[PDB]
């Protein structure tokens, strides 16, 4: 058969790449980790190095503290019995303060004071990690695209655990930390609000998520189809248009009667994805704050 470029036929390895320097501070880069031949069939074989600075460690510490805090309470739930712990793993949950404690921090440990602790660490972890994304871009002289996009995700997350809880008047409105429990919370949320399928932003969020799969499918396949002309090297196809970029554009023009550019398609890409959480967070934030029942609101304002 024809080789389809899904898996590498011959891996090749040179010295480890320490990366471009520019204005980065080299003190805070690690040494190169090992080399995965496993990864090499699909992607690069090189792990590392990694930049961990001050803001880096703060994030990486916080996130572990968030994780460990949940696990400790998870062990307690299991009664410190390893066999129970593994059995009930999806069933354990660290729940937020009950509604009587409102927005206050005075709620007891076992009563979800623990959950506020854990959230704090999570709060610190993400926002520090966010600035970390910006910062590494700054030092490379690059665009803040990654960090602006990551904000979009932070948005939904900020709305589910923080902003919407403030607006509703309690922490009890927030999401529990647990596998099944949080799943339940999601489904309970929809029912309480009169079926989110009636929430127009929810519907849009879906469109973008499906579309994200549709777009990336298109795009990914398209690059592989044209990888015979050097397609995946996209920056240089941007700077100097190749026969790769051309037949890429023309497949789509001939099919659907319009097309994109090697740069343009990535604007489509970033927006397709970003719109998912963007509309998502609006959909959630409006639910219970303004719109009580999406079926009902949709009976008038539809």
């Amino acid at each position: 058969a024809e080789y389809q470029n899904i898996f590498t036929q011959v891996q090749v390895r040179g010295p480890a790449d320490l990366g471009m320097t520019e204005d980065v501070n080299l003190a805070n880069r690690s040494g190169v980790g090992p080399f995965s031949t496993l990864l090499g069939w699909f992607g690069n074989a090189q792990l590392g190095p990694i930049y961990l600075g001050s803001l880096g460690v703060l994030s990486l510490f916080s996130g572990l503290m968030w994780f460990f805090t949940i696990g400790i309470w998870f062990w307690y739930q299991a009664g410190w019995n390893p066999a129970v712990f593994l059995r009930d793993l999806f069933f354990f949950s660290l729940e937020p303060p009950a509604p009587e404690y409102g927005l206050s921090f005075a709620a007891p440990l076992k009563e979800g004071g623990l959950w506020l602790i854990a959230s704090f660490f999570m709060f610190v972890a993400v926002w520090s990690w966010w600035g970390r994304t910006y910062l590494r871009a700054q030092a490379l002289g690059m665009g803040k695209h990654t960090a602006w996009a990551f904000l979009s995700a932070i948005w939904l997350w900020m709305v589910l655990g923080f902003i919407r809880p403030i607006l509703m008047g309690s922490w009890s409105e927030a999401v529990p930390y647990g596998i099944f429990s949080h799943l339940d919370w999601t489904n309970n949320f929809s029912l309480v609000h009169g079926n989110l399928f009636y929430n127009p932003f929810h519907g849009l969020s879906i469109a973008f998520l499906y579309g994200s799969a549709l777009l990336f499918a298109m795009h990914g396949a398209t690059i592989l189809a044209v990888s015979r002309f050097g397609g995946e090297r996209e920056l240089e196809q941007i700077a100097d248009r190749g026969t790769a970029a051309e037949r890429a554009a023309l497949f789509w023009r001939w099919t659907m009667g319009f097309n994109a550019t090697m740069e343009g398609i990535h604007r489509w890409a970033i927006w397709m994805a970003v719109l998912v959480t963007l509309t998502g967070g609006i959909g959630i934030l409006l639910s219970g704050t303004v719109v009580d029942n999406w079926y009902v609101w949709g009976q008038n304002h539809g």
Binding site: D88, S212, A213, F216, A269
Partner: protein
């Protein structure tokens, strides 16, 4: 009208069926044999959906819906008003998708690129056929398939999932959502990384594929590479649709009870089953 670079690629050849008969364009659109089939099917079914919009009574799009044959018709045919239209229109849509795909293949051969796109489009076609065809046939009735209407087909997603409890608990469904969520994260990143590069801080030079590697190695400590992120995107996407079709082919056939209950297999495992403590002891 052609793109400035276009003419050199419009050349005879590449056709799967009919030689040079349909080999030509209308405006931007390549036609070929499967262009013609697609029109036929798509237009026939579009006429038929227009007709069901009579027997229903309305021309409003938030309203028009074509419901499948009722559960009592089984796999047999139904009168056109009673869901016979659906069967034809369904057959029609299958005709248009497959024609569309092979058309992309024809477009592919002429452009000398690989077939990856219509291969990926197949999975979408395959998901759809699961819901309208494979799952209904495994089940015994056309009525188990979703109606074609903007809002009413959404009703059927809710009806169907809630038959099984909170549907979150279908495990194939879980893997499906994980692939979607990841794809969308991976799309966001990928798009950002190419863009941050081609459009760096004001007045600076374009960054390089090395700068991209560096950024991610700086950030998460690993970079999958520019051939890989395309492999990744394609894979994350198709895996989501694969596990979507799967999650739905097993529901109403091999597993018909509440999906949450499927999970007790793990919890009733002999070594920890009767131990006290936790939630289940």
């Amino acid at each position: 009208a052609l793109l400035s670079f276009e003419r050199k690629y419009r050349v005879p050849g590449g056709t799967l069926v009919g030689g040079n008969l349909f080999d030509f364009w209308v405006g931007p659109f390549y036609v070929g044999f499967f262009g013609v089939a697609t029109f036929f099917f798509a237009a026939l079914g579009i006429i038929l959906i227009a007709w069901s919009a009579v027997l229903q009574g309305t021309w409003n799009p938030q309203l028009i819906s074509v419901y499948p044959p009722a559960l009592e018709y089984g796999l047999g045919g139904a009168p056109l008003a009673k869901g016979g239209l659906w069967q034809i229109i369904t057959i029609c849509a299958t005709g248009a998708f497959v024609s569309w795909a092979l058309r992309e293949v024809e477009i592919c051969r002429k452009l000398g690129i690989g077939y990856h796109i219509p291969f990926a489009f197949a999975f979408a076609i395959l998901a759809y056929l699961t819901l309208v065809l494979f799952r209904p046939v495994m089940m015994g009735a056309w009525g188990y398939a979703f109606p074609y209407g903007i809002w009413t087909h959404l009703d059927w997603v809710s009806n169907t999932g809630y038959t099984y409890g909170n549907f979150h608990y279908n495990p194939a469904h879980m893997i499906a959502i994980t692939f979607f969520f990841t794809n969308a994260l991976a799309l966001a990143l990928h798009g950002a990384l190419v863009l941050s590069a081609a459009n760096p801080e004001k007045g600076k030079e374009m960054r390089t594929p090395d700068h991209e590697d560096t950024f991610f190695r700086d950030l998460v400590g690993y970079s999958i590479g520019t051939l890989g992120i395309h492999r990744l995107g394609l894979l994350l996407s198709l895996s989501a649709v694969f596990f979507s079709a799967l999650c739905m082919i097993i529901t109403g056939t091999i597993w018909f009870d509440q999906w949450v209950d499927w999970w007790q297999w793990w919890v009733k495992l002999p070594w920890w089953a009767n131990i006290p403590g936790g939630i289940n002891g």
